[PDB]
């Protein structure tokens, strides 16, 4: 249940910079030698300011084409569309779930149903 | 404003139940899990009748149960409330003041997960008794207990709340 040395609430309130030092290579270099794009960066402040301003049950759950943006600890607690190549997949991010791409939790494939 | 001291509530006993069809040796494997926790030999209950959905065939051992009481009862049940985050569903209390909960993982109770011992889920049920209930079980003078002295579920939820500080 505890994630990367932080309890669920601590990591939830921890900044993106805080969880970044102890993380996987792709995650560390995502911002370490790189950063984020301006489109990717804007999307963060299109749910962030909504996740922190709940007036009741969320009326947003916005549908976003952007998919492989590594999820941020703060964005935990909300459902993101994580568009697969056709239809949006509603995804609620678990606090231990953070530290990996929103791509991993979204299914664009058929599970099985063949073998004929 | 004082209840008689016999009107207190005591955990008479705790039952421990598994239902591993019969498989090839699974019931024996659960015997190991029960033996360490209760320090007692679990007795193998038996299947009644033969059914299609499960593999019981009127003679396959289908379940293992041990009844634990006193100091052991408190600790084994306290384990069960911590692992159930001090939360229990409200309807679990029954008509005779008996309540139960479910325990995923024989390992979650602090037993080490083993390749040799596969995870076996068990379930619990704790029987609450008001001192003076012997009138129902003694070989001589066996007569039913009176209405007041029987634990009503509302009174027992209060004893569970007082005993473990649980919430529903």
């Amino acid at each position: 249940p505890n994630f990367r040395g932080v309890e669920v609430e601590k990591l939830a309130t921890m900044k993106i910079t805080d969880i970044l030092p102890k993380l996987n290579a792709r995650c560390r270099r995502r911002i370490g030698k790189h950063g984020l794009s301006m489109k990717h960066l804007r999307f963060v402040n299109k749910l962030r300011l909504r996740r922190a301003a709940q007036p009741s049950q969320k009326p947003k759950i916005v549908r976003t084409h952007l998919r492989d943006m590594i999820i941020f600890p703060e964005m935990i607690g909300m459902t993101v569309s994580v568009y697969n190549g056709r239809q949006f997949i509603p995804v609620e991010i678990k606090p231990p779930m953070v530290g990996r791409a929103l791509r991993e939790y979204s299914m664009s494939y058929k599970i099985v149903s063949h073998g004929k | 404003e004082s209840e008689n001291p016999m009107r207190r509530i005591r955990i008479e006993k705790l039952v421990l139940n598994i239902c591993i069809g019969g498989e090839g040796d699974a019931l024996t494997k659960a015997a190991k899990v029960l033996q360490q926790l209760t320090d007692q030999e679990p007795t193998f209950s038996k299947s009644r009748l033969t059914i299609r959905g499960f593999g019981i065939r009127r003679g396959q051992k289908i379940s293992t149960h041990v009844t634990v009481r006193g100091e052991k009862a408190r600790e084994i049940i306290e384990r069960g409330l911590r692992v159930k985050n001090f939360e229990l569903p409200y309807s679990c209390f029954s008509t005779t003041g008996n309540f139960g909960f479910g325990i995923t993982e024989h390992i979650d109770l602090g037993i080490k997960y083993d390749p040799s011992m596969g995870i076996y889920g068990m379930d619990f049920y704790v029987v609450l008794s008001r001192p003076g209930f012997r009138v129902n079980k003694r070989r001589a003078q066996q007569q039913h207990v009176g209405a007041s002295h029987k634990i009503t579920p509302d009174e027992a939820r209060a004893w569970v709340e007082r005993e473990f500080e649980v919430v529903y």
Partner: protein, 146 residues
């Protein structure tokens, strides 16, 4: 020679033939991240019968495995470098390997993901070779609920 066959530790029998080194990577395999980077040396003899090894040498060996960092083994040899738990670098021993595997697989199920579906459905994960390569045994995408 007091070869002393068996000398089992960690609930895993060893041999009077195995050299002191293969004896740990051969402790069920599970329980020893090997390549013998530190195993080759440790404090134990390089090439002798593994039963002959004295208990005191075995006990010091048990201690080096118990605290790898104290021995001076670099973190890269150890398996769990960052930990998704309390985030503390740790070695894996025999029982914890399959407990941690449950931790890795059951976490996968609770945090539903393509990497979990590619394990609950038993499809090989990552390779995407469930197309024309592994007729082998029938561990391939089949299906037939109705």
């Amino acid at each position: 020679n007091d070869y002393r066959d068996l000398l089992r530790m960690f609930n895993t029998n060893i041999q009077g033939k195995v050299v002191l080194e293969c004896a740990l990577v051969g402790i069920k395999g599970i329980g020893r991240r090997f390549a013998n980077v530190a195993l080759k040396k440790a404090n134990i003899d390089v090439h002798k019968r593994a039963g002959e090894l004295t208990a005191a040498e075995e006990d010091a060996l048990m201690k080096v495995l118990e605290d790898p960092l104290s021995h001076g083994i670099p973190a890269w040899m150890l398996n769990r470098n960052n930990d998704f738990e309390s985030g503390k670098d740790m070695h894996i021993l025999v029982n914890t390997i399959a407990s941690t595997h449950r931790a890795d697989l059951e976490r996968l199920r609770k945090t539903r993901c393509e990497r979990g579906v590619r394990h609950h459905h038993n499809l090989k994960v990552r390779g995407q070779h469930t197309k024309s390569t592994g007729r082998r045994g029938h561990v391939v995408g089949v299906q037939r609920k109705k």
